[PDB]
């Protein structure tokens, strides 16, 4: 398995509702026909990519199980004869079973205690870590004792109660211990070498904070349709001094069922852009104008570009069609809702009436761009933290993203080129490229999953693909899109000037 | 230094009693588990009972379980044992034994400071 | 409860020549074992302690390994003062100690 579906579907969630925000934009620039069929490929090679660095992850995750000595095996013994001998204790009756269950794993704990335990083998014997653990597994020796003291006695069911207490205990002690995340940056190491991993960090933290700096701009370009009862920069600098006094990060993991929410109202906003136009039916004027000729066609390329980019950096086929089902509808709605006149507005929310759903979009945009900068400040600055090794050092973190905001105060150009730049490279090269430089031996091709499905007879196949993408990325985003896009941009920043002070007002 | 003594040993007719004392100066009990480990003449050792006197946690062994008594005392620094229905098997010496308290190395050292033990007997 | 065998149940040798005793252990404890020097007439006394350390206060040539459920113990030289029974004898719990048969070293003549 691999237990990355939930980081994909978060990931993507960003991505999407960022992209769902700025898409219209870039659809008019690119044209109904190719919009769609750039759209459609993207999204599938995509999710192809993302299976390749489930395969990737997983491989790496094998070799280490296997090339891995085996030694450190005995303690994994003595854990299942804990186990074990604890549902038999649970199955147990009377008093002769479950004492020489207390003898046996008793025994086993001492074993246990003078082994060392597979995550710190590199720290001294005296390291507090290594004398924590030791602390440990003497307090759990103690309540062995106090069980088996109680055993002795014949007070048979106390000895069940002691048996679930030292069950809770060595859980809470050892699976909050024990259980450790893999980041894909040491999967990379793991695989090629130090000089990838060297030049893969760099690119990883880059676009992190790209596109923490591209959250961050989107609550400005958004509230701001809430009220203009001051420019987009003084809301920006509140917001920008709200999200930095949460300057402390609480540790929060597992937001699966946390972005359950987020998909619901990231539904329900397409929703809202899709259905404002299909029955109100504001279209009216020229809609049909391009695609242009001009290399525009590509600004809105790399913006497309940006999406399904969150499915591979999380590791830092229904899915992707979810993802389908709620962007295109809502594209193809808002071009035919206004049509050319969005060229000049980069966001949606522009040619919406002031009618109560916009203001629950509004709102609902709101509270998912908290939830999301919420789950995504953790991973930069853990590695910010790791970089150089409470808060006396990262308390400044946030003054170059507002710095890098306030210069650019744009929804769509800069978002081009981050999409052509940053994503385009992490998120499609990188992985493909890595996955096959890893299996150019061919005893490398001897230890790997087959070809999932029943479509394609074939083995050779996956050199096929993955020959072609790396290519095709290349020359398509950074090869045109990416000069198109940084055009756009100087052209933007040329207009309303360094530090511009507001856009579109 | 530190030393133990044990008194009050001699022969009783088969079904009497005595009365054993594990005296401990110098060093404390009042937090040490006292144990017993017999010894039949020219035969190997055997462990008879134990005394936690810190909570109490007084378990005998098979072959004696349900004949001997080993109460607790802690003003004297001192663990006594009576012993009822003794047997011709019984006669034998018995020494008393010190061992630290779980965990850490006076626990992981056993019985260390033996003391010169006693002598009795069951005869007719 | 568990069970413990001494398979040198005799030894007889020399003075100045290496000797070793085994130690078997029915189950598969945890170290936890000691070996008492037990002089004839008088109180044994810990020698051997966790089946790999020293007890501080006698001399060094003794010392003892551990190997899966079998414990033995090595003594260099042997001094003509060593000659006497060399008890295996392991501790799990409070209440769940046991002795082995015992060893008896001789003089060879």
């Known amino acids: 398995g691999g237990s990355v579906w939930d980081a994909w579907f978060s990931c993507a969630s960003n991505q999407v509702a960022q992209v769902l925000l700025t898409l219209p934009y870039s659809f008019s620039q690119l044209g109904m026909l190719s919009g769609i069929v750039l759209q459609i490929f993207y999204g599938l090679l995509g999710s192809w990519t993302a299976y390749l660095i489930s395969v990737l992850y997983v491989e790496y995750r094998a070799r280490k199980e296997k090339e891995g000595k085996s030694f450190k095996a005995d303690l994994e013994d003595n854990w299942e004869t804990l186990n074990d001998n604890l549902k038999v204790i649970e199955k147990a009756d009377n008093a002769a079973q479950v004492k020489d269950a207390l003898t046996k794993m008793r025994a086993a704990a001492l074993d246990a205690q003078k082994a060392t335990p597979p995550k710190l083998e590199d720290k001294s014997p005296d390291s507090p870590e290594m004398k924590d653990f030791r602390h440990g597994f003497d307090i759990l020796v103690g309540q062995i004792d106090d069980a088996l003291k109680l055993a002795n006695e014949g007070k048979v069911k106390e000895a069940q109660a002691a048996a679930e207490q030292l069950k809770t205990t060595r859980n809470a002690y050892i699976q909050k211990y024990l259980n450790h995340v893999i980041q894909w940056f040491e999967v990379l190491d793991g695989l090629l070498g130090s000089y990838w991993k060297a030049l893969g960090l760099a690119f990883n933290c880059t676009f992190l904070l790209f596109g923490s700096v591209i959250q961050l701009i989107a609550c400005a370009s958004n509230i701001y349709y809430i009220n203009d009862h001051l420019d987009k920069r003084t809301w920006t600098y509140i917001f920008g001094a709200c999200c930095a006094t949460t300057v402390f990060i609480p540790s929060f993991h597992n937001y699966r069922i946390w972005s359950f929410l987020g998909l619901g109202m990231t539904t329900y906003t397409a929703w809202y852009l899709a259905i404002a136009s299909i029955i109100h039916g504001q279209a009216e004027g020229v809609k049909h104008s391009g695609p242009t000729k001009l290399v525009l066609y590509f600004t809105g390329a790399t913006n497309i570009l940006y999406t399904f980019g969150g499915h591979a950096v999380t590791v830092e086929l229904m899915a992707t069609l979810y993802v389908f089902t709620l962007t295109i509808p809502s594209a193809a709605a808002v071009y035919w809702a206004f049509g050319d006149a969005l060229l000049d507005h980069s966001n949606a929310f522009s040619l919406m009436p002031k009618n109560a759903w916009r203001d629950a979009a509004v709102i609902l945009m709101l509270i998912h761009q908290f939830i999301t900068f919420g789950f995504a400040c953790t991973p930069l600055y853990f590695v910010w933290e790791k970089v150089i090794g409470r808060a006396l050092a990262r308390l400044p973190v946030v003054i170059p993203i507002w710095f890098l905001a306030i210069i650019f105060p744009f929804f769509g150009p800069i978002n081009s080129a981050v999409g052509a730049l940053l994503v385009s490279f992490t998120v499609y090269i990188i992985p493909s490229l890595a996955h096959m430089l890893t299996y150019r031996s061919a005893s490398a091709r001897q230890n790997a999953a087959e070809k999932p499905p029943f479509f394609m007879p074939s083995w050779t196949a996956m050199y096929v693909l993955n020959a072609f993408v790396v290519v095709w990325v290349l020359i398509v985003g950074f090869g045109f899109g990416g000069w198109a896009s940084v055009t756009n941009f100087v052209r933007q920043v040329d207009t309303f000037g360094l530090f511009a002070k507001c856009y579109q007002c | 230094e530190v030393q133990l003594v044990e008194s009050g040993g001699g022969l009783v007719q088969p079904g009497g009693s005595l009365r054993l004392s594990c005296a401990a100066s110098?060093?404390?009990?009042?937090?040490?588990?006292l144990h017993w480990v017999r010894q039949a003449p020219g035969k190997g050792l055997e462990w008879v009972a134990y005394?936690?006197?810190?909570?109490?946690?007084?378990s005998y062994a098979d072959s004696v379980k349900g004949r001997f008594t080993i109460s607790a005392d802690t003003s004297k620094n001192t663990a006594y044992l009576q012993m009822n229905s003794l047997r011709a098997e019984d006669t034998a010496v018995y020494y008393c034994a010190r061992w630290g308290y779980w965990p850490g190395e006076p626990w992981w050292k056993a019985f260390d400071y033996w003391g010169q033990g006693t002598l009795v007997t069951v005869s007719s | 409860d568990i069970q413990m065998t001494q398979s040198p149940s005799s030894l007889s040798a020399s003075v100045g020549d290496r000797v070793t005793i085994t130690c078997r252990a029915s189950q598969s404890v945890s170290s936890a074992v000691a070996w008492y020097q037990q002089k004839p007439g008088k109180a044994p006394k810990l020698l051997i302690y966790?089946?790999?350390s020293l007890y501080s206060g006698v001399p060094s040539r003794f010392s003892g390994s551990r190997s899966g459920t079998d414990f033995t113990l090595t003594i260099s030289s042997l001094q003509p003062e060593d000659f006497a029974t060399y008890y295996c004898?392991?501790?799990?719990?409070?209440?769940?100690?046991?002795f082995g048969q015992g060893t008896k070293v001789e003089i060879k003549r």
């Open positions: 005394i936690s006197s810190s909570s109490g946690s007084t």
């Open positions: 110098g060093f404390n009990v009042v937090d040490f588990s």
């Open positions: 966790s089946a790999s």
């Open positions: 004898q392991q501790y799990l719990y409070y209440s769940l100690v046991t």
